[PDB]
Amino acid sequence: HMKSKLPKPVQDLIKMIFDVESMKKAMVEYEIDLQKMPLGKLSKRQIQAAYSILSEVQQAVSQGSDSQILDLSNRFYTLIPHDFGMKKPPLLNNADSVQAKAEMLDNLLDIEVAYSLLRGGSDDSSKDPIDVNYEKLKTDIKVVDRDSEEAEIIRKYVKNTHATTHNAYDLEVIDIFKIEREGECQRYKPFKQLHNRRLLWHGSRTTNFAGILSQGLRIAPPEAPVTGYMFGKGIYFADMVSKSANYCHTSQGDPIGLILLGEVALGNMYELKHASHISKLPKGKHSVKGLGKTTPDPSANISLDGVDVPLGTGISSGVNDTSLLYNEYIVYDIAQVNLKYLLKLKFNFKT
Ligand SMILES: NC(=O)c1cccc2[nH]c(C(=O)N3CCNCC3)nc12
Numbered sequence: 030h031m032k033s034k035l036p037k038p039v040q041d042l043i044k045m046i047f048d049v050e051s052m053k054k055a056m057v058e059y060e061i062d063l064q065k066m067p068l069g070k071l072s073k074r075q076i077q078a079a080y081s082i083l084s085e086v087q088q089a090v091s092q093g094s095d096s097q098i099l100d101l102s103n104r105f106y107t108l109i110p111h112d113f114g115m116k117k118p119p120l121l122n123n124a125d126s127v128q129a130k131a132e133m134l135d136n137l138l139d140i141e142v143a144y145s146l147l148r149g150g151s152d153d154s155s156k157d158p159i160d161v162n163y164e165k166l167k168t169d170i171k172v173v174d175r176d177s178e179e180a181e182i183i184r185k186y187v188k189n190t191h192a193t194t195h196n197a198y199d200l201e202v203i204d205i206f207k208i209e210r211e212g213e214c215q216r217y218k219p220f221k222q223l224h225n226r227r228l229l230w231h232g233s234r235t236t237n238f239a240g241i242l243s244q245g246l247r248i249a250p251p252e253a254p255v256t257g258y259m260f261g262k263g264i265y266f267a268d269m270v271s272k273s274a275n276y277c278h279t280s281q282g283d284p285i286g287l288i289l290l291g292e293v294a295l296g297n298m299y300e301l302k303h304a305s306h307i308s309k310l311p312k313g314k315h316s317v318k319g320l321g322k323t324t325p326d327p328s329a330n331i332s333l334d335g336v337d338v339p340l341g342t343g344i345s346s347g348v349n350d351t352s353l354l355y356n357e358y359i360v361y362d363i364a365q366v367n368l369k370y371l372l373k374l375k376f377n378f379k380t
Contacts, residue, residue, distance in 0.1 A: 033157035038172050038204040040159045042373065045285070046238040047147060047162050052140050054283075055236045057112075059133045065110035069148065071141040076134055079108040080252035083130055086121050087254040098122050105130065109137075124256065131257030135249065139240035146239060166242045169209040173370070180205055182333050183290065183370065186228075186340040187270050190325060192355060193343075195271035197380055203285070204373040210245055217367040220294035223315070228338045228369065229266035229358055230273030231289040238287055246291070246366055260317045261307045263359035264366060266293055268325050268339045272355050279376045290370035292336050293358060302351040310361060319357035320348045336369075 033040060045051075052068055086101045102121040111118055121130065146165040153161075163170070173180050187202055220226075233241060249262045258265075267273040270288070277286030296315030310317070322345070329341025346356075360366065 030155055030157045033160045035159060035163060036172050038373070039163070039170055039206070042170070042204070042206065042287075042371075043159050043162050045235055045287070045373075046242075047143065048236075049144075049147070051236050051283075052144065055136065055140065055234065059136070060111045060113070062110040062112040064112075068140070068144055071137060071144065073138070073141060075108060076138050076141065077250065077252050079105060080131070080134055080250065080254070082108060083127060083134070083257070084252065084254040087127050087256045090122070090124060090127065091256075095120070095122060109134075127254055128257050131249070131254055134253070136234065136237060139237040142244060143236070143239035146243065166239065167211040168242045169211075170371070171207045173205040173207050179207075179333060182331065182338060182340070183372070186290075186338060187372070187374075189329075189340050189342045190269045191271045192269050192323070194354065195275065198376045198378045200270065200274060201375040201377070202372050203375050206371040206373075208242070208368055208371050210242065210368055213245060213367055216364045217292075217294075220296075220365050221367075223294040223296045225295040225298065225316075226336050227268070227293055227295060227358070228290055228333060228336050229268055229293050230270055231264070231266050231291060232273035232276035233287070233289075234276070234278045235285075235287050241289070245363060245368065246289075247363060248361065255306045255308055258306070259304050260301065260319060260357070260359045261305070261361075263317065263361040264363065266291065266358040267355065268358070269321075269323075269343065269355045272357075274374065274376070277374075277376075281378050284376045284378065286374055286376060288372050288374060289368055290372070292367040292369050293360060294365045294367075295358060295360070298358075302348065302353070304352065308361075315360070315365070317359040317361075319353045319359070320351050321346055321353045321356035322348060322351055323354060324356055 082105045089098050089101055106118050183205055184202055246264045255261045273288055279286040297313055298316050298318035299310055299314040300318045300320055302320050323343040324346040325339040326341025326344045331338050
């Protein structure tokens, strides 16, 4: 092929995010039987069906037996086949089982999106598949320059917002990308001047990123158990990098991961200290803020292109009986997000 004029870091990202082996590795992390549910047989409507049964299991857990649960648990396993041999699989009987399986389903939705891009489209060997797969993302991706001012600001956000309680690892920023999803800026125009616009982190495993870049960040579908997510079905962001970095699910067997910096239009925040599973905000509120014990120093806020960047080192927030060690941010309409950056990070595990 003609060999691709994309910059090296961008070609590496495309390799990373369309890796079919990482998709399969992720599936077997979730205990899915690839003999019975291979990558190419994944489909939205099976994932959707599974979501509803999970919501049934949610229903039975909300209202309390271990015999009247069994059937609901088993129906779940009927829809997404797991790998337990001649088995009896573990019973899905508690709220943690519901969270776990809804996190998995999230991730299969995204893997299905990624694979259907690979398997939709045309086949032309004289083009570089790197270039081809780049187009499938409908996203402009540029390398940000190590000496630029935006790079300085970003690396400082990373440097100052790593929580002491996440010191099992640290982070090097390998590459910084400026990104522009096709049509997102149009989607965002209603919110482009809203008060309380913040630049914030969103972490995800790297197998989600083709989906994230083609579709944007999304809300979990109506079928999904709202109980599966602490503040219900929104898009979750953090102001401490390590908090969002933990959701990369990197480790000593895959130390490289990807994290986002989106501009998020929070406006009038509904502030909450504990788990609250809602599907609409109260009238007048635009977002939820889960109140952390620690917060970036509000005195060190700093503007990058007229959007506040909360990059001060963590101080006490003043909040007393909160469930959350760190702030957390949720919006319930996808048009309130404009993705701006993507970092590739190297995690040094000190263990
Ligand atoms: N994705 C994040 O970086 C993130 C940041 C702050 C709070 C969060 N809470 C969650 C969260 O629990 N999720 C659960 C299932 N997948 C969507 C994300 N993710 C985050």
